[PDB]
Amino acid sequence: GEVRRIKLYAERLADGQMGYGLEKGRATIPGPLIELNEGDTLHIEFENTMDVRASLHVHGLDYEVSSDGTTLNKSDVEPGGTRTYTWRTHAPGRRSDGTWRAGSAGYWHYHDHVVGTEHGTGGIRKGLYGPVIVRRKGDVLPDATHTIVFNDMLINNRPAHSGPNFEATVGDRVEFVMITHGEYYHTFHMHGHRWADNRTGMLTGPDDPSQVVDNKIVGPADSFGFQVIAGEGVGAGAWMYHCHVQSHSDMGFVGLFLVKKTDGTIPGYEP
């Protein structure tokens, strides 16, 4: 259980998007990946650099109403204002009542709750979302982590036929965090790969009856994640991921998981 501190800034981007960043003028969409171990406390020294009220609200983690990031709990930030948000986490364990307390561990996310509406509809639309992973002791750690956000009809707020693409090598342990926002349900599909429908996205062993899937229905504020061995049993290639709702996939919102051979090459593809 470390007590940890980061700085976070909400910025309006040149293009009129809105992003979180770890430093001024370094905002990204999605926002920076926050990673904590169960038991860790994080203090986020947040600065709203924008000319509108903005906030930081987190799913899954332990927070008091004063870190709700809502108008209801007097927890949003005035233009140019500052606020320290506090996120706590806990390990699982036996309560006195003999019950098992579930831990914080999982694939989570943070987003604005007051831009445009008192539910953050405008901030979320403009890019104020990012991933949070809470790890349990012993969890398997990846070679890389990639965050895919279905935000209305967009992926990571990109234009149609502009990715995002993620590169790996065959055999790499690659982690995906998959977050949904906005108005629409979606189905997330990845070619050539599959994962478990459980906390880690990985089967614990032969006694784990979790469905193994390559396609998952998601709605606004859903988060899940998984890890794959890149190209396992399928080889190097351009492995598309996309929404499987037919009108959505036809808008040209598709990304590629580019799995290269150890010589840096990939079977030829036509994007």
230-249 positions binding Cu ion, by CB under 5 A:
243, 245, 248
DSSP secondary-structure letter at 136? P
Question: Is residue 262 at the binding interface for a second copy, with CB under 8 A as the rule?
Answer: no
**Residue 96 and residue 68 in contact, taking contact as beta carbons nearer than 8 Å:** no
# of chain residues touching Cu ion (CB under 5 A):
8
Residue 249 is a binding residue for a second copy (CB under 8 A): yes
109 is in an annotated binding site: no
Q: How many CB atoms lie within 10 A of CB 13?
A: 16
- Subset of residues 189 to 218 that bind Cu ion, contact rule: CB under 5 A: 189, 191
* Region 203-242 residues binding a second copy, contact defined as CB under 8 A: 203-224, 229, 232-240, 242
90 is in an annotated binding site: no
Query: Residue 48: which of 84, 83, 10 has the closest Cα?
Result: 10
Find the binder of a second copy among 73, 81, 158, 164 (CB under 8 A).
73
Can you give the C-alpha Rg of the chain in angstroms?
19
- For the record, the structure tokens of 226 come out as 């998984």
> Which DSSP helix (H) or strand (E) runs through 129?
strand 129-135
| Listed ranges 23-31, 38-46, 47-55, 94-102: which one lies at the site for a second copy (CB under 8 A) | 94-102
Q: Which residue numbers belong to the known binding site for Cu(2+)?
A: 57, 59, 111, 113, 186, 189, 191, 242-244, 248, 270
Q: Which residue numbers belong to the known binding site?
A: 57, 59, 111, 113, 186, 189, 191, 242-244, 248, 270
